[PDB]
Amino acid sequence: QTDMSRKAFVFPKESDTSYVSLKAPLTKPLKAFTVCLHFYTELSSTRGYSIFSYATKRQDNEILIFWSKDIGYSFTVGGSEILFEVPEVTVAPVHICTSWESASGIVEFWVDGKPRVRKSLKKGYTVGAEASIILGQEQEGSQSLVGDIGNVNMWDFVLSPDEINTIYLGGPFSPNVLNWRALKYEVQGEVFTKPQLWP
Amino acid sequence: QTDMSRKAFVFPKESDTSYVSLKAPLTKPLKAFTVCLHFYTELSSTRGYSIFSYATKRQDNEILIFWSKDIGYSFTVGGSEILFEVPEVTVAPVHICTSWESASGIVEFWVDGKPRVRKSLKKGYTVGAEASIILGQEQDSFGGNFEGSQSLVGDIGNVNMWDFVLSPDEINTIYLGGPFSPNVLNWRALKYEVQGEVFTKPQLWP
Amino acid sequence: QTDMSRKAFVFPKESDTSYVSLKAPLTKPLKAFTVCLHFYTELSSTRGYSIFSYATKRQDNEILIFWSKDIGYSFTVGGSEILFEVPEVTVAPVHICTSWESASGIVEFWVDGKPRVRKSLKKGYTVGAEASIILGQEQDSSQSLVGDIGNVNMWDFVLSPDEINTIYLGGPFSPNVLNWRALKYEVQGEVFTKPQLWP
Amino acid sequence: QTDMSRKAFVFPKESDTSYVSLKAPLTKPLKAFTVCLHFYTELSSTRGYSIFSYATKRQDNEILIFWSKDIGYSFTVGGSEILFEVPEVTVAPVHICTSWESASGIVEFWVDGKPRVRKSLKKGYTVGAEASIILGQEQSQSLVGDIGNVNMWDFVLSPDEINTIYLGGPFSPNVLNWRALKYEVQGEVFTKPQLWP
Amino acid sequence: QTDMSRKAFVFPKESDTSYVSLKAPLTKPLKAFTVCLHFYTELSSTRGYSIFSYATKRQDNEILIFWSKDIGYSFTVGGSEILFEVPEVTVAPVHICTSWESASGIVEFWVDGKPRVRKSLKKGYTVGAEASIILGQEQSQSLVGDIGNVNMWDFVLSPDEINTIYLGGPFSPNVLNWRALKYEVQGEVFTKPQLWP
């Protein structure tokens, strides 16, 4: 239980063993969720990489925020992948918030405070509870994250825009699954903790 | 009679059966009108779709706000179509207000608070009163079943309709989110009937 | 004598008979002048059209503000034409003010409050007094205006920039030839009076 | 001695005889200087023209601010020319301030309040005192448009000072003062209120 | 010990002998550092040049901020070089701050107040203390233009701190202080008021 406020994990160079493991005190399977985070990297234009990986015994790609080169963002929950295209890539810290709701299969994807069209994905699904959450790696390094990532947070329900807007503006949020202000992690490899570059 | 304030219909995926039906307490035929709405979608650059469909038995295209790919907006009242070209399309929630006045055939088309040149269309014509208003789908057969190739995928809301031509000042206000008092289709007191894969979620645009 | 304040003439569709005729209480020949107006149309990119036509018995093109496609603005006084080029045309209401001074032949051309280089055109001449001023059509004993035009005003002397700036900002002015606040016109054809679209 | 404040010379059409002559009460040769002015024209994209011409008996191009088409600004003092390139030309009134200092040969060139890299030119030189300063002409290149707010100091203005002049702050020139100009017109050139603020 | 506040070294023309030598009262080897400076030049698009050169007996390129044409910025400490690419070059005064930390080999590179992705370079390593710091030269690589506001700390500045320095806030360097610089000029290089604000 550490307060990562104002700090961020940084992955200096391409590796095959460096990654961060977040431990979520999960007890109930997810029927909806929302994860937000900040990440800054220069890979975008050259190759792909993993931002957020959430895997279960039965499914290694239960919930995964990925960036496939020359295409855009790839949000995938429960093996099924959906794509949020992005034509012109810009090098700069970016903040994202994505959410999925089983009851309707509506997935939202917010980038830098602005929302992308809503979409449908994995209706009537159910995300496993006991899982292994990892930052910087793909549960292979050709998909490794090189740069900084931080301010990751996760709620077990779908945040409303107003709420999302606030989080972006750096307003007070109360996560209930993954809280940056009280994170329980386990580092491994060449990854450090330094003050965050984005405001 | 529901207050849809701060909410919006969302059409997640391409369908052939999903659509929303608005019920207007119409009694007199329209001699002029104004309809405004908010819609956000990603189709624009790939295919066309229907924004607002108002059809009468005698006429399937009484009043219809459509988006024909690679061209722009297609406003059509009473079968006759007029085009409001738009070269560079930008992905983002957009708000539109269009109005037609029989006595002159002058149709206005406001986009995001800014107006496009005035035009002439179906002067003298008269819009039927008893009609079927639908959101998200293209009435091409006043009977039932539709053809997805023109379906709306995304969110649409804040639709409102007056039986007279709104003045710019008024239109400006509506855009800024000021109070107004529609008299045909009121978002604050909407009477609808959903059908298919369409939900009600908080609106994304401010 | 009507107060056209906050209103504008609108020419809905292409015609060969629609036009507006302004009546100026002229008694002395012009030795200098300034005319300002607001007009919004979509023709610009396709064909040419007449904005302001002022013709005399001896000369039908005494003073005429025209828009020749793919070139720019064509200001012409007394048969002689001068050109104010405009490369990239933008669809939006535009406000213009142009002025000519016999004593020097210096013609100014202001667009949306900003001025274009000064030019020389007909020095010594004297514009006729008794004339027929028309809006929307081209006087000549195909090139009709389709859209809205309003806020036309005319002084018998050259307005200073400061003055011009004010007019643009919507500040009080006192025209002495053609006053929008006390216009005396005569419509003819398919042309209506509706509230102006530009602020 | 006239106060040209708020006014500007305007050259309506291309001529071969129109120009303005400024008279400087010079007595000592220049060992450094700074000249600023406002000029608005449409030639830029088509041909070249002379902005400021300062010539001496032995040298007709003692100090000259010129605009060579498709290249940029050409500042030249004492016959030697230096170039301040400008790729994308934009039609709009522009204000410039350029200065040269013999002791180092460092020439500054400010455009619309922003400075261009410093450069070296004619170090050790010494500009003649008795000269003929002309606006609009080259002592094919005539200036067509308006030019005004010309001022000249016999020393190098500091950035702060230059910044002020641009913002329209009070400046006390000591060679060529717009507020107390002594000129002599000739040709088709008039005096009208300035277009730029 | 001079207060170079509001002034800058200017290298007017390409030379093979002109340069500035900074003297640092170093006594302990560096285990981390941060250097910031302002430089304005027109070379960028044509050739390469040296911004900051710090060399030791053991390694003449102990720490060097360089600009390799058509590529971007080249930060190199202890011989090992790393590259901070920059596609579209823009002519204008630029301010940079770069820092390296032995304990992790994390090098930061801030340009005009904005940071570039972090990188790893020379870990464990120890920069020599007794060195020769030079500005404008490489201990077809000479700097032509102005350079100033150089400062150096023996520890890694935090973003907040860096942000402040950029905004012109008060800072307390402990290795190279612009407000109390001890230098030695040599060649055609002068001291003039800085062009950038």
Cβ distance of B201 and A106 shorter than 8 Å: yes
Strands ordered across the beta sheet of C185-188: C80-85, C72-77, C63-68, C49-55, C132-135, C19-22, C185-188
Q: Please give the sequence-ordered ranges of beta strands (E in DSSP) within B121-191, or none if there are none.
A: 132-135, 154-162
Token representation of residue D79: 């016959």
Chain E residues contacting A via beta carbons under 8 Å = 104-106, 115-120, 158-160
Q: Rounded to an integer, what distance in angstroms lies between the CA atom of residue A25 and that of residue E138?
A: 57
Residue with tokens 């971007």: E72
Residue A101: strand, helix, or coil? strand
Helix (H) or strand (E) run with residue C164 in it: helix C161-169
Task: Report the domain count for chain E.
Answer: 1
Give strand pairing partners of A81: A76
Closest CA to B110 of B121, B93, B95: B95
CATH of residue A50's domain is: 2.60.120.200
Give the residue from chain D lying closest to E194, CA to CA. D159
Token representation of residue A199: 């405001």
The reply to whether E186 sits in an annotated binding site is no
Chain C residues contacting B via beta carbons under 8 Å = 10, 12-13, 40-42, 91-92, 146-148, 190, 192, 194-197
Contact C152, C136 (CB under 8 A): no
The reply to whether B186 sits in an annotated binding site is no
**Resolution in Å, one decimal place:** 3.2
Beta strand pairing call for A132-135 and A147-155: unpaired
Helix (H) or strand (E) run with residue A108 in it: strand A106-111
Token representation of residue C34: 């300034």
Query: Distance, in angstroms, between C10 CA and closest chain B CA?
Result: 8
Q: How many CB atoms lie within 10 A of CB D93?
A: 20
Of D106, D158, D159, the CB nearest to E10: D106
Q: Whole domain around residue D133: which residue ranges? A: 1-197
Q: Please give the sequence-ordered ranges of beta strands (E in DSSP) within chain E, or none if there are none.
A: 7-11, 19-22, 32-41, 49-55, 63-68, 72-77, 80-85, 94-101, 106-111, 114-120, 132-135, 145-153, 183-186, 190-193
Q: What is the DSSP string of D54-91?
A: EE-SS-TTSEEEEEETTTEEEEEETTEEEEEE-SS---
At residue C168, what are phi and psi to the nearest 5 degrees? -60, -50
Q: Rounded to an integer, what distance in angstroms lies between the CA atom of residue B200 and that of residue B198?
A: 7
Token representation of residue C173: 């002015």
Contacts 24+ apart (CB under 8 A), D163-168: D163/D113, D165/D36, D165/D97, D166/D95, D166/D97, D166/D110, D166/D112, D166/D113, D167/D113, D168/D197
The CA-CA-CA angle for residues B107, B108, B112, to 5°, reads 150
Which amino acid, E171?
F
| Contacts of residue E12, Cβ cutoff 8 Å, sequence gap at least 6 | D104, D105, D106, D118, D119, D120, E144, E188, E189, E190
Closest CA to C109 of A150, D12, B100: D12
For B32-49, letters b (16+ CB in 10 Å) and e give bbbbbbbbbbebbeebbb
For C84-96, letters b (16+ CB in 10 Å) and e give beeeeeeeebbbb
Residue D179 half-sphere exposure toward CB, CA atoms < 13 A: 7
Give strand pairing partners of E40: E146
Q: What is the DSSP string of B18-81?
A: -EEEE-----S-BSEEEEEEEEEESGGGT--EEEEEEE-SS-TTSEEEEEETTTEEEEEETTEE
Residue B145: strand, helix, or coil? coil
Give the residue from chain D lying closest to E93, CA to CA. D117
Partners of E116 on chain A (C-beta within 8 Å) are 42
Of B42, B197, B203, the CB nearest to A117: B42
Closest CA to C167 of C22, C6, C35: C35
At residue C27, what are phi and psi to the nearest 5 degrees? -140, -25
Chain breaks in chain A (C to N over 2.5 A) after: 139
Residue A132: strand, helix, or coil? strand
Q: Rounded to an integer, what distance in angstroms lies between the CA atom of residue D6 and that of residue E165?
A: 41
At residue D179, what are phi and psi to the nearest 5 degrees? -75, -15
The reply to whether D146 sits in an annotated binding site is no
Q: Rounded to an integer, what distance in angstroms lies between the CA atom of residue A151 and that of residue A171?
A: 12
Residue of C73, C97, C118 best to disrupt the D interface, most CBs of D under 10 A: C118
Of A105, A116, A161, the CB nearest to B12: A105
Q: Rounded to an integer, what distance in angstroms lies between the CA atom of residue D113 and that of residue D166?
A: 6
Contact B152, B136 (CB under 8 A): yes
Of A12, A41, A197, the CB nearest to E159: A197
Residue D46's alpha-carbon distances to C87, D144, D189, in angstroms, are 15, 12, 22
Question: What is the distance, to the nearest Å, from the Cα of residue A35 to the centroid of all Cα atoms in its chain?
Answer: 6
Residue A93's alpha-carbon distances to A12, A40, A53, A96, C166, in angstroms, are 15, 4, 19, 10, 45
Partners of E13 on chain D (C-beta within 8 Å) are 119-120
Question: What is the distance, to the nearest Å, from the Cα of residue D58 to the centroid of all Cα atoms in its chain?
Answer: 20
Q: Is the dihedral of CA C103, C106, C111, C115 positive or negative?
A: negative
Q: How many CB atoms lie within 10 A of CB E158?
A: 15
Contact C179, C24 (CB under 8 A): no
At residue B53, what are phi and psi to the nearest 5 degrees? -120, 125
Helix (H) or strand (E) run with residue C133 in it: strand C132-135
Question: What is the distance, to the nearest Å, from the Cα of residue A129 to the centroid of all Cα atoms in its chain?
Answer: 17
Question: What is the distance, to the nearest Å, from the Cα of residue A74 to the centroid of all Cα atoms in its chain?
Answer: 11
Q: What secondary structure letter does DSSP report for E189?
A: -
The reply to whether B150 sits in an annotated binding site is yes
Helix (H) or strand (E) run with residue A166 in it: helix A161-169
The CA-CA-CA angle for residues D145, D148, D152, to 5°, reads 140
- Residues, chain D, total? 197
Method: X-ray
Residue of B110, B118, B166 best to disrupt the C interface, most CBs of C under 10 A: B118
Residue D12: strand, helix, or coil? coil
Contact E152, E23 (CB under 8 A): no
Residue A152's alpha-carbon distances to A23, B1, B206, C78, in angstroms, are 12, 42, 26, 73
Token representation of residue D60: 């007709």
| Contacts of residue C70, Cβ cutoff 8 Å, sequence gap at least 6 | none
Q: Rounded to an integer, what distance in angstroms lies between the CA atom of residue D142 and that of residue D47?
A: 10
Helix (H) or strand (E) run with residue B173 in it: helix B168-176
Token representation of residue A116: 């992308």
Question: What Rg, from alpha-carbon coordinates, does chain D have?
Answer: 15
Contact C11, C146 (CB under 8 A): yes
Q: Which chains touch E (3 or more CB pairs under 8 A)?
A: A, D
Closest CA to D156 of D4, D34, D74, D3: D34
Question: What is the distance, to the nearest Å, from the Cα of residue D158 to the centroid of all Cα atoms in its chain?
Answer: 18
Residue E99: strand, helix, or coil? strand
- Helix and strand tally (H, E) in chain C? 1, 14
Q: What secondary structure letter does DSSP report for D143?
A: -
Closest CA to B52 of B62, B38, B65: B65
Chain D residues contacting E via beta carbons under 8 Å = 104-106, 115, 117-120, 158-160
Q: Rounded to an integer, what distance in angstroms lies between the CA atom of residue B159 and that of residue C126?
A: 58
Partners of D159 on chain E (C-beta within 8 Å) are 193-195
Closest CA to B125 of B162, B142, B100: B100
Give the residue from chain A lying closest to B8, CA to CA. A118
Question: What is the distance, to the nearest Å, from the Cα of residue E5 to the centroid of all Cα atoms in its chain?
Answer: 17
Q: How many CB atoms lie within 10 A of CB D182?
A: 13
Residue A60: strand, helix, or coil? coil
Please give the span between the terminal C-alpha atoms of chain A, in angstroms, as a whole number: 23
Helix (H) or strand (E) run with residue B171 in it: helix B168-176
Q: Rounded to an integer, what distance in angstroms lies between the CA atom of residue E115 and that of residue E163?
A: 10
Q: Please give the sequence-ordered ranges of beta strands (E in DSSP) within chain D, or none if there are none.
A: 7-11, 19-22, 32-41, 49-55, 63-68, 72-77, 80-85, 94-101, 106-111, 114-120, 132-135, 145-153, 183-186, 190-193
Q: How many CB pairs under 8 A join B and C?
A: 34
Helix (H) or strand (E) run with residue E47 in it: none
Q: Rounded to an integer, what distance in angstroms lies between the CA atom of residue C51 and that of residue B102?
A: 28
Contact A24, A178 (CB under 8 A): yes
Q: Rounded to an integer, what distance in angstroms lies between the CA atom of residue A149 and that of residue A38?
A: 6
